[PDB]
RNA sequence: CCAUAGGUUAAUGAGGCGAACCGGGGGAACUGAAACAUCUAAGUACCCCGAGGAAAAGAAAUCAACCGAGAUUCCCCCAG
RNA sequence: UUUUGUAUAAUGGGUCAGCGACUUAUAUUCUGUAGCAAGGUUAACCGAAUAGGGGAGCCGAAGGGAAACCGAGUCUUAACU
RNA sequence: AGGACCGAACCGACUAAUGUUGAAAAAUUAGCGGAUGACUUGUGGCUGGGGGUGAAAGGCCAAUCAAACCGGGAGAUAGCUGGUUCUCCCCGAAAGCUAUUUAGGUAGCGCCUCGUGAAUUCAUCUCCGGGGGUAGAGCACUGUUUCGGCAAAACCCGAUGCAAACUGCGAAUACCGGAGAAUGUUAUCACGGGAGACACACGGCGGGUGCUAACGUCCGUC
RNA sequence: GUUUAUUAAAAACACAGCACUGUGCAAACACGAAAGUGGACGUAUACGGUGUGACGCCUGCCCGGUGCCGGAAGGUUAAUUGAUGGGGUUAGCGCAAGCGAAGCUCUUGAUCGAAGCCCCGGUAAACGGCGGCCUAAGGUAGCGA
RNA sequence: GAACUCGCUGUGAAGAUGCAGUGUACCCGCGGCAAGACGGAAAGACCCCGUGAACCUUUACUAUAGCUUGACACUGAACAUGUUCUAACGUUGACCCGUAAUCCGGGUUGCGGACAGUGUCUGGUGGGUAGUUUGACUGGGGCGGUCUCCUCCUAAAGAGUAACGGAGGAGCACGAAGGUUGGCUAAUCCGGAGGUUAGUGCAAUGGCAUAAGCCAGCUUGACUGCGAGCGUGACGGCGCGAGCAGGUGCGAAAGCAGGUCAUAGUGAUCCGGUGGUUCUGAAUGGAAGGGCCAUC
RNA sequence: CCGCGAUGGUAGUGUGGGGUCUCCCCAUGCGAGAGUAGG
């Protein structure tokens, strides 16, 4: 009665902290907002976080909930 | 059970969109203002057969 | 004797200036209502044959 | 009934053989398609008839494109 | 020889001598090499001619577009940042 | 009289032994059945291959029969098996992924080789920037569990454990990026010519399966 | 009696007998592109096909399925025929947009239309079937580890 | 294959004359026996595999001989919308002649007669005959199960990762359940406590209060052309995306909107259909057909 | 900006080596979680 599975979705972090990225570059693929969009980062319809400017990726923990945000520090 | 329909431009261009409809629940004709790229204006589009 | 062109390949590929091949994208013949306009728009322009496939296309089109 | 069929004789010709080529009457399948039926192999193999030193074809109810060509046959291109 | 692996009790060979398996034609691409070079090269054929003639053609010097068409651009689009 | 009876010739072929590189590619020996009949035999004739003939066994059709023999199509096809012949020098795999009427075949990619081009391109270490949810741990959560207390035995509280599909915690390593030196025959990447390979095996470590059975089986990694 | 020439001789095949069924003679049927020939120089007490297998006592129920036989009202239905509509072309008409006769032409397919099938019956010595509320009908006689 | 061809216990492609260790054994015949040389013989017949074969079966597929239907032809004449007629045609009735002939032909005559029969076309029937198909995975094959897509775990804290491993889902729904602006906050227990323990259109996981949960008003951005850059794939492909142009909705405006909390809800190419179209149009003008765009 | 916590020990673990090898130990490096003092 078992024997089924789905294709692996290649989620996860594509660009880690301090990496130089071009605008448009995908930083994380995820299901929901496990990471949140900080400065110069957009959030796509499938919760993909992507760079809206050229610069370096920065992960940070901010807010009252203590949420993982991703920003781009512009070069 | 949802059936494919055309939405046909009222501008007389022959431009159409396609969508689906549940004709059992919603037998009345779908009418929407949509962009007609031929005349390059938003005009009324009205349901027709696919 | 002369090599014969694979005539089905000649109807689907055209050789470009630097010797690549252009083709029409798959998935824009039918079952179009369910496809997003964005997806269909991106399938309209012709594309280049990929590196992996060039060997197969060249074999089929010796007089390209 | 006239006749015609039929009968006898005479003259002239034919008959059979032969390797290929040639025109015609018929005409496979294996095989390929990675199976298979459309399709392919192929109008091939093979069978049959007929001919000649060659045969067949041949003097436009042909092409062309508004300019023109000028029977048929064969070769090189056009072009995989 | 075949195999993950064979002294293998897996295969093949009694021995010797002789013969016995990547060829040939045409097309196409790449490499080497030679000629000529924005050109290169001729086919059939003619020629007693490996000569010489024959440039019909073929490839190249421009591309883009399904195409008309435009052309160092062109296509896309009403039009391109 | 008789598809009557016993029994030679004649026609058969039930049993046994022998023989089995035989005396014989079906016999010999001892026994056995029919023996006036739907009998047996000589000579000649007729039926021809998807055809004949068959008191029917797919039997027989010249020691050949679920489609004769001979010649031809013909070198059918063979993703299968076998075999593949002189010498030296340099490099040197794979037995994986994806797809496949695919699974012992094949294709693209990965890995080999040759050529060409190109960056401090690549590797090791050190330092720096990163995301982790594994090991371990824990029990707030999702389940499971025992004891006591409390009390509508629920709930709640204290105490004790357990978890691949539990996480209010959380390593080592590994991986991505940056910087720096030393070292390394560019070890790197791209493009092009030529491949082979896509049956793997055992051992260590982490696991699923099996019985923490298998020289078992299926992954990861060396 | 017959049989697997060469591992099977038998309970297998055949058989007289039985039944069903076809066949009116240029028979059915078979061999044959055909002409013809066999059937048969026979003629239904004959000939072919099928099953059963001397003889004795017998051979029950089911026609729903499949076949065969009969029916022929109705439905459906071929070639054929080409009504009707729609289009192409262009003599014209239009200042232009367009419209557009005749002819030719592309398409559409009214009407006509047999057997078959559906349909209505029959038929089991046709192929077959023969119960634990259900079926076409529920296995009779005889026999039975 | 070559042999100078012992036993044993181990080892080992896992049952050893040939390896290890060890024991035994002077060299060579002859008659005997068959335990071993996985002895000889035959490229296992069983079993599986090959997109091998043959022949056989049938309500497998596609054909087809035969049988059968009708139309037209050979094929005609009188009214009926009935039959009759003779002249085509048939005769495997009789007689005559060619003729020494149960063939054949001709003649005469009778019978039948536009029927029968044959050709072309056509519906039916058609294992009588023919060509073929009849999947793969698989702890042998078969039987059963499975085959594409989504979620979790296995999965070793980046990605990926197998088994006929462990568990569940999908093949949609929705003109609002989409867009925007404003407003609102649950389960459960007894107004209060509690704080998401609820909710999500549907599995599971990760998300969601700024709520993505929930209500109302106004709406059609479930827009058209494009797209820096990036993710993921052998490839075909699939995904995310600021921003630009045009035109739009909501809001006061900033802004937001290129469908839906996200991840399933799917099908290449061919062939053809429909609409559109500054394309093509085999002498020329058209047309047909083709192309392109949208779509089935 | 976003409401705890040493020290020590213990668990685990990279590399190398070892055993009585379903599990451990040694050398070296890294070193939790829980809890304790305390804040
Ligand atoms: K990226
Ligand atoms: K064939
Ligand atoms: K094949
Ligand atoms: K083997
Ligand atoms: K063997
Ligand atoms: K060459
Ligand atoms: K050259
Ligand atoms: K450009
Ligand atoms: K034969
Ligand atoms: K491959
Ligand atoms: K290479
Ligand atoms: K391993
Ligand atoms: K006997
Ligand atoms: K019946
Ligand atoms: K007309
Ligand atoms: K020894
Ligand atoms: K022996
Ligand atoms: K007569
Ligand atoms: K008639
Ligand atoms: K298995
Ligand atoms: K097994
Ligand atoms: K806009
Ligand atoms: Mg998987
Ligand atoms: Mg998953
Ligand atoms: Mg289309
Ligand atoms: Mg084939
Ligand atoms: Mg002569
Ligand atoms: Mg002549
Ligand atoms: Mg003229
Ligand atoms: Mg083996
Ligand atoms: Mg060895
Ligand atoms: Mg030996
Ligand atoms: Mg050997
Ligand atoms: Mg072998
Ligand atoms: Mg041998
Ligand atoms: Mg050009
Ligand atoms: Mg007697
Ligand atoms: Mg006999
Ligand atoms: Mg005897
Ligand atoms: Mg007797
Ligand atoms: Mg006797
Ligand atoms: Mg038999
Ligand atoms: Mg014989
Ligand atoms: Mg045969
Ligand atoms: Mg051949
Ligand atoms: Mg051969
Ligand atoms: Mg080396
Ligand atoms: Mg796939
Ligand atoms: Mg644990
Ligand atoms: Mg866990
Ligand atoms: Mg680094
Ligand atoms: Mg394979
Ligand atoms: Mg493999
Ligand atoms: Mg394997
Ligand atoms: Mg492996
Ligand atoms: Mg292990
Ligand atoms: Mg193993
Ligand atoms: Mg093991
Ligand atoms: Mg007897
Ligand atoms: Mg015998
Ligand atoms: Mg016998
Ligand atoms: Mg007769
Ligand atoms: Mg009987
Ligand atoms: Mg009728
Ligand atoms: Mg009755
Ligand atoms: Mg009784
Ligand atoms: Mg031993
Ligand atoms: Mg001896
Ligand atoms: Mg003996
Ligand atoms: Mg042997
Ligand atoms: Mg064999
Ligand atoms: Mg008739
Ligand atoms: Mg049949
Ligand atoms: Mg058959
Ligand atoms: Mg064939
Ligand atoms: Mg077959
Ligand atoms: Mg299989
Ligand atoms: Mg992972
Ligand atoms: Mg990991
Ligand atoms: Mg792997
Ligand atoms: Mg694998
Ligand atoms: Mg799996
Ligand atoms: Mg780009
Ligand atoms: Mg077709
Ligand atoms: Mg024209
Ligand atoms: Mg014309
Ligand atoms: Mg068109
Ligand atoms: Mg400490
Ligand atoms: Mg601590």
């Amino acid at each position: 009665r078992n024997g089924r599975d789905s294709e692996a979705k290649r989620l996860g972090v594509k660009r880690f902290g301090g990496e130089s990225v071009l605008a448009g570059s995908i930083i994380v693929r995820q299901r929901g907002t496990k990471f949140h969009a900080g400065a110069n980062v957009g959030c796509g319809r499938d919760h993909t976080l992507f760079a809206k400017a050229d610069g370096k990726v920065k992960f940070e923990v901010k807010g009252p909930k203590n949420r993982k945000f991703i920003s781009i520090e512009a070069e | 059970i949802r059936e494919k329909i055309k939405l046909v431009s009222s501008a007389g261009t022959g431009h159409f969109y396609t969508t689906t409809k549940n004709k059992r629940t919603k037998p009345e004709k779908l009418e929407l203002k949509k962009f007609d790229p031929v005349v390059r204006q938003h005009v009324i589009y009205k349901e027709a057969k696919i | 004797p002369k090599i014969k062109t694979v005539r089905g390949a000649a109807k689907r590929f055209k050789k470009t200036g630097k010797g690549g091949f252009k083709h029409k994208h798959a998935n824009l013949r039918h079952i179009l209502t369910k496809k997003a306009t964005k997806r269909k728009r991106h399938l309209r322009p012709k594309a280049m044959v990929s590196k992996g496939d060039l060997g197969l296309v060249i074999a089929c089109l010796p007089y390209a």
Side-chain angles (χ1 to χ4, degrees), chain A residues 2-75, chain B, chain C:
Chain A
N2 307 315
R4 291 172 301 295
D5 203 2
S6 59
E7 197 77 357
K9 289 286 171 293
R10 287 80 172 159
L11 301 180
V13 175
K14 304 304 183 182
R15 299 290 179 107
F16 294 84
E19 288 200 56
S20 295
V21 299
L22 303 180
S25 295
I26 288 170
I27 306 162
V28 60
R29 295 193 58 237
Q30 52 179 354
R31 294 287 169 253
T33 54
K34 172 146 45 53
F35 302 88
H36 292 248
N40 303 301
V41 168
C43 192
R45 65 171 296 289
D46 67 347
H47 305 106
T48 299
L49 304 188
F50 62 92
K52 293 177 74 173
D54 300 2
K56 299 207 306 183
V57 172
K58 175 74 180 78
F59 293 78
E60 62 196 1
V61 184
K62 300 191 186 296
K65 300 173 189 185
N66 308 0
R67 282 178 168 186
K68 302 175 302 308
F69 274 71
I70 307 184
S71 60
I72 301 297
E73 306 302 297
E75 207 81 67
Chain B
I1 294 295
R2 294 186 73 91
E3 183 172 0
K4 286 183 290 295
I5 57 163
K6 281 184 181 185
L7 295 174
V8 178
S9 185
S10 62
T13 60
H15 184 264
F16 62 94
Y17 292 81
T18 56
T19 186
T20 63
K21 202 180 72 156
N22 188 351
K23 297 198 178 181
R24 294 135 53 70
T25 59
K26 304 300 176 77
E28 65 178 61
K29 288 272 183 163
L30 180 59
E31 306 188 4
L32 295 171
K33 289 179 180 64
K34 303 191 67 59
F35 187 69
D36 186 331
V38 182
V39 293
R40 304 174 59 217
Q41 291 293 304
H42 277 72
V43 299
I44 294 168
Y45 279 66
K46 300 189 294 190
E47 175 181 340
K49 287 173 172 62
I50 194 68
Chain C
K2 294 182 181 183
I3 304 173
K4 294 222 181 179
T5 299
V6 180
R7 302 296 288 140
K11 288 157 172 166
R12 292 172 168 104
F13 302 103
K14 303 291 165 175
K15 193 169 189 176
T16 68
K18 286 171 154 178
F21 290 85
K22 65 177 180 181
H23 73 88
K24 177 175 167 63
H25 281 297
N27 297 319
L28 202 71
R29 288 304 205 200
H30 71 163
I31 314 171
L32 293 157
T33 299
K34 69 174 63 169
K35 296 175 181 146
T37 304
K38 179 188 173 189
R39 184 179 165 200
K40 292 179 292 197
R41 169 157 34 71
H42 285 118
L43 292 169
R44 259 204 300 287
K46 303 296 192 292
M48 298 301 294
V49 172
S50 66
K51 187 205 174 295
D53 298 311
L54 275 173
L56 297 166
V57 174
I58 290 160
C60 291
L61 298 178
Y63 291 101

